[PDB]
């Protein structure tokens, strides 16, 4: 009975682990089909509705079936990941913590930094009795016992590692020997080790790929309520295709530099806004009507973000937007200001970004 | 140019020793001998510490080697710095 | 077939001008500069289209009033009522415009969603215009660089080692002029042929 | 220093390694202090020199600004350094570094909230899922479904991971709430 | 291309002697022997 149920469940786990990647492909395929159908929505006219007007007429039930299929496939993707990749992550964590415990003595000689979230969580796995369950060297508790027993206290180190000398010696001698039938539910309930499972669930929750799958999942579920959330699943082609991953790695290789370049551009635009707000204020009238006194640069915030938006977007610069300096006292000063804005903000910094991308690909 | 200069600095330091100028392969014939040479045999920090210790030491307390290096440092003659040779190269026969 | 069709309609003779690429080797090199990364270029265009689609989704959800394009105030000409029309409006004018979709759609001044529309326009300009076009340009530039570096590598390899046996040039050059003596008499490609 | 000199000039002598094993603790203590270089000797032979290194000198050598200055010096010498003037520039760098070192020594003499919130969120969002097994409702489930059905079994198998996902969602929401409380 | 050509010129002159064509390492086995060779043994101005 129990053997049959465990065997059938193991068969299910093996099937999902086998077909993890295929349904990962199929989810992207369904995400493409759903968005292709979505591209045909039409707005109809308080209350506003989006209706699907098509010559076929039948791709609305088809869209609903595709949404349901996408969610089912997505859930099976989490099942496949949890049966395929999770053991490897647990094995890597277990080997890392075992070697840090045995060689560096990160929990005996020194202590975790209290900033390392993984170390703070892995404090528990030592007390867990199933220390390296997946990691095949089941032997590290006694290795550490031999290495650090003499100084740090035999009993204290034994209690830190969760093992018990008296029971060890009594098991070496005669002990209580009685097996139990597998059909008993009490056997399974006692065999389950809540401490190790809590640690494993914490590790899995901290894992990034399973978090990405959960995000994909919540987006599919939300797409059921509002169909347009199915479009966010198109961000998955980047990891679907390795070559798109290379193209994105070209730009993401210098993300820190790109962000700091944007900060520098913002500071330069702020300085130009300061100069304009101090001297060149009349020229920022933007009202096409002469009568209305619409001023962009009366407020310092409005002047700055005007420079942020239109001066940056414009090919020539802020001068193409603000009034010409012809026949003015500050003609030459405004002119040098516009030329410098065009030369620095437009010609140089955008070139800096472009060169960042090019040389990263190089 | 900036990036290529950084690459050149890295390549030069990992390919040849900074002081004597012998290639990394000859030292690496012995396992790990290259960074062994660059961290114990010929160490930049070690030379700086030796200069500090020699400056701080009294004159008459100097040993023969210390006094000889002191005289070269006073006369600005840098022939005491090894160039194209090392202890292992000098004693290839005995050491191996 | 193009010449034969050009007899019926004389303008089909213009398609024969696509033959200069293989007529001149140097134009073949210039075209090889861009065609060296054709797969990457196509996938970059696909990525740009996906990003524009996401921006169209956002605009169709929230920023719809601003897409009125009728110069006449009376006529209610809406670009983004239909999702297809909104998307391809973003495909065409937002992509072509130097500043972005904001230079085409209505300004956000005095609106509840002013800051959100503004961040949307700034991000559109930064990603679609500044970055992806730069990605294409860098693809072309670095492909041409790859071609030149490959030529340099060929030259360096041939002048540093013999093609057949693979011994370095220095050993042969120990004897004066022995390297090219070896490569022209001892080990000659034409001689083996 | 005497034992190290003997060790480095008597490489093969086993009695010498026996003495070294006997005196490892002293050598372990004096490992940072002992420093070695090679110089072009007066007898036209490479000579190894041993001397005392102060731990203060080691610390003001290992301070970060000195390391950055050393990296900049390395960059400059690699890029525009001549073979004649390389050794001289190195000596000038050493002298300046020693002076700044001594001056530094002379002037010298005489997140956790977010981490804790996230950890606590982990604990009380995983104990919520542990509480089904703790409260043993699965036992009464077994009593009412004693007749083994593949339909029900597959449904429960899916429900396990479905509940895991709900616990993750609650965990993420709790983390965001705690972070917002921390920042505000 | 211009910059790489300048780098190649510099690298070639500092790596091998212009006249005989022997590598710098063999001369540098003797201290300072490479520029000693290029400034006294094999000098372009001296040949001119
Ligand atoms: N004579 C030398 N003295 C010191 N290091 C040398 C010497 N010759 C070559 N090197 C190399 O230069 C480097 C100096 O050490 P290194 O740069 O790793 O120091 P660090 O400050 O600890 O680290 P980082 O690599 O981040 O600068 C090493 O790679 C070493 O092998
Ligand atoms: N086994 C080899 N056979 C022929 N050439 C070799 C061999 N190994 C190296 N080489 C080198 O490859 C080159 C072949 O000759 P080269 O390229 O000069 O011919 P070409 O057609 O007269 O001129 P070009 O340089 O314009 O191609 C020479 O530089 C020669 O030294
Ligand atoms: N046969 C050679 N004759 C002369 N110089 C040679 C020869 N072989 C290699 N070289 C190198 O070429 C260079 C010639 O001297 P160098 O270029 O320094 O002259 P300069 O006019 O004084 O200075 P600059 O470096 O600014 O040109 C040196 O680095 C020298 O080592
Ligand atoms: Ca004396
Ligand atoms: Zn050295
Ligand atoms: Zn040959
Ligand atoms: Zn020569």
Swiss-Prot record, chain E:
Tissue: Detected in heart muscle (at protein level). Heart muscle, brain (cerebellum and hippocampus) and placenta.
UniProt subcellular location: Sarcoplasmic reticulum membrane
Post-translational events: Channel activity is modulated by phosphorylation. Phosphorylation is increased in failing heart, leading to calcium leaks and increased cytoplasmic Ca(2+) levels.
Triggers of expression: By TGFB1.
Free-text note regarding domains: The calcium release channel activity resides in the C-terminal region while the remaining part of the protein resides in the cytoplasm.
Recorded family membership: Belongs to the ryanodine receptor (TC 1.A.3.1) family. RYR2 subfamily.
Function statement: Cytosolic calcium-activated calcium channel that mediates the release of Ca(2+) from the sarcoplasmic reticulum into the cytosol and thereby plays a key role in triggering cardiac muscle contraction. Aberrant channel activation can lead to cardiac arrhythmia. In cardiac myocytes, calcium release is triggered by increased Ca(2+) cytosolic levels due to activation of the L-type calcium channel CACNA1C. The calcium channel activity is modulated by formation of heterotetramers with RYR3. Required for cellular calcium ion homeostasis. Required for embryonic heart development.
Subunit-level organization: Homotetramer. Can also form heterotetramers with RYR1 and RYR3. Interacts with FKBP1A and FKBP1B; these interactions may stabilize the channel in its closed state and prevent Ca(2+) leaks. Interacts with CALM and S100A1; these interactions regulate channel activity. Identified in a complex composed of RYR2, FKBP1B, PKA catalytic subunit, PRKAR2A, AKAP6, and the protein phosphatases PP2A and PP1. Interacts directly with FKBP1B, PKA, PP1 and PP2A. Interacts with SELENON. In cardiac muscles, identified in a complex, composed of FSD2, CMYA5 and RYR2.
Entry's disease: Ventricular tachycardia, catecholaminergic polymorphic, 1, with or without atrial dysfunction and/or dilated cardiomyopathy: An arrhythmogenic disorder characterized by stress-induced, bidirectional ventricular tachycardia that may degenerate into cardiac arrest and cause sudden death. Patients present with recurrent syncope, seizures, or sudden death after physical activity or emotional stress. CPVT1 inheritance is autosomal dominant. Ventricular arrhythmias due to cardiac ryanodine receptor calcium release deficiency syndrome: An autosomal dominant arrhythmogenic disorder characterized by syncope, cardiac arrest and/or sudden unexpected death, often in association with physical exertion or acute emotional stress. Patients who survive manifest polymorphic ventricular tachycardia and ventricular fibrillation. Unlike typical catecholaminergic ventricular tachycardia, arrhythmias are not reproducible on exercise stress testing or adrenaline challenge.
Entry protein name: Ryanodine receptor 2
Naturally occurring in which organism (per UniProt): Homo sapiens
């Amino acid at each position: 009975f129990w053997k049959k149920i465990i065997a059938y469940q193991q068969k299910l786990l093996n099937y999902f682990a086998r077909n993890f990647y295929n349904m990962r492909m199929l989810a992207l395929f369904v995400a493409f089909a759903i968005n292709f159908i979505l591209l045909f929505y039409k707005v109809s006219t308080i209350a506003v509705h989006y209706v699907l007007e098509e010559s076929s007429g039948y791709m609305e039930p088809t869209l609903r079936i595709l949404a349901i299929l996408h969610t089912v496939i997505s859930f099976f993707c989490i099942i496949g990941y949890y049966c395929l990749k999770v053991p490897l992550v647990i094995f890597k964590r277990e080997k890392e913590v075992a070697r840090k415990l045995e060689f560096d003595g990160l929990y005996i000689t020194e202590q975790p930094s209290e900033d390392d979230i993984k170390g703070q969580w892995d404090r528990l796995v030592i007390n867990t009795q199933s220390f390296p369950n997946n990691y095949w060297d089941k032997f590290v508790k006694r290795k550490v016992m031999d290495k650090y027993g003499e100084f740090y206290g035999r009993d204290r180190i034994s209690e830190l590692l969760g093992m018990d000398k008296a029971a060890l010696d009594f098991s070496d001698a005669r002990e209580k020997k009685k097996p139990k039938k597998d059909s008993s539910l009490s056997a399974v309930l006692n065999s389950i080790d809540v401490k190790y499972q809590m640690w494993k669930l914490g590790v899995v929750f901290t894992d990034n790929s399973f978090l990405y799958l959960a995000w994909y999942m919540t987006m599919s579920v939300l797409g059921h309520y509002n169909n347009f959330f199915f479009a966010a699943h198109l961000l998955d082609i980047a990891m679907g295709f390795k070559t798109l991953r290379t193209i994105l790695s070209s730009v993401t290789h210098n993300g820190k530099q790109l962000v700091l370049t944007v900060g520098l551009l913002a500071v330069v635009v702020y300085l130009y806004t300061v100069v304009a707000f101090n001297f060149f204020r009349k020229f920022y009238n933007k009202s096409e009507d002469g009568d209305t006194p619409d001023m962009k640069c009366d407020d310092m915030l409005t002047c700055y973000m005007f420079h942020m938006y239109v001066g940056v977007r414009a090919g020539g610069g802020i001068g193409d937007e603000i009034e010409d300096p012809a026949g003015d006292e500050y003609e030459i000063y405004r002119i040098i200001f516009d030329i410098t804005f065009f030369f620095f903000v437009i010609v140089i910094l955008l070139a800096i970004i472009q060169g960042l991308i090019i040389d990263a690909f190089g | 140019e900036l990036r290529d200069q950084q690459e050149q600095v890295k390549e030069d330091m990992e390919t040849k020793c900074f002081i004597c100028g012998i290639g990394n392969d000859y030292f690496d014939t012995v396992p790990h001998g290259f960074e062994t040479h660059t961290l114990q045999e010929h160490n930049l920090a070690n030379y700086l510490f030796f200069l500090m210790y020699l400056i701080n030491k009294d004159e008459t307390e100097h040993t023969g080697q210390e006094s000889y290096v002191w005289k070269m440092y006073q006369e600005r003659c840098w022939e005491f710095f090894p160039a194209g040779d090392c202890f292992r190269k000098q004693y290839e026969d005995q050491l191996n | 077939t193009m010449s034969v069709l050009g007899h019926y309609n004389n303008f089909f003779f213009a398609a024969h001008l696509l033959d200069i690429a293989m007529g001149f080797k140097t134009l073949r090199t210039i075209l090889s500069s861009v065609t060296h990364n054709g797969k990457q270029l196509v996938l970059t265009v696909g990525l740009l289209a996906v990003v524009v689609y996401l921006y169209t989704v956002v605009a169709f959800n929230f920023f719809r009033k601003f897409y009125n394009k009728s110069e006449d105030g009376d006529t209610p000409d809406m670009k983004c009522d239909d999702m297809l029309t909104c998307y391809m409006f973003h495909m065409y004018v937002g992509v072509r415009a130097g500043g972005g979709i904001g230079d085409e759609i209505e300004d956000p001044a005095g609106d509840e969603y002013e800051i959100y529309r503004i961040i949307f326009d700034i991000t559109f300009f930064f990603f679609v215009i500044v970055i992806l076009l730069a990605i294409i340009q860098g693809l072309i530039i670095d492909a041409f660089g790859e071609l030149r570096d490959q030529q340099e590598q060929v030259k360096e390899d041939m002048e540093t080692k013999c093609f057949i046996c693979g011994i370095g040039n220095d050993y042969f050059d120990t004897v004066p002029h022995g390297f090219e003596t070896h490569t022209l008499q001892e080990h000659n490609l034409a001689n083996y042929l | 220093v005497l034992l190290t000199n003997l060790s480095e000039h008597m490489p093969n002598d086993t009695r010498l390694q026996t003495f070294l094993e006997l005196a490892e603790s002293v050598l372990n203590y004096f490992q940072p202090f002992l420093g070695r270089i090679e110089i072009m000797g007066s007898a036209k032979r490479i000579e190894r020199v041993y001397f005392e290194i102060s731990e203060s000198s080691r610390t003001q050598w290992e301070k970060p600004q000195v390391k950055e200055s050393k990296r900049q010096f390395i960059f400059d010498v690699v890029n525009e350094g001549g073979e004649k003037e390389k050794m001289e520039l190195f000596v000038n760098f050493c002298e300046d570094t020693i002076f700044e070192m001594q001056l530094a020594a002379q002037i010298s003499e005489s997140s956790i909230l977010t981490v804790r919130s996230a950890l606590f969120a982990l604990r009380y969002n995983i104990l919520t899922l542990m509480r089904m097994l703790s409260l043993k409702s699965l036992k009464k489930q077994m009593k009412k479904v004693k007749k083994m059905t593949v339909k029900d079994m597959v449904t429960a198998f899916f429900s396990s991971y479905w509940s895991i996902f709900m616990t993750l969602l609650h965990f993420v929401a709790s983390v965001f709430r705690g972070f917002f409380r921390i920042i505000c």
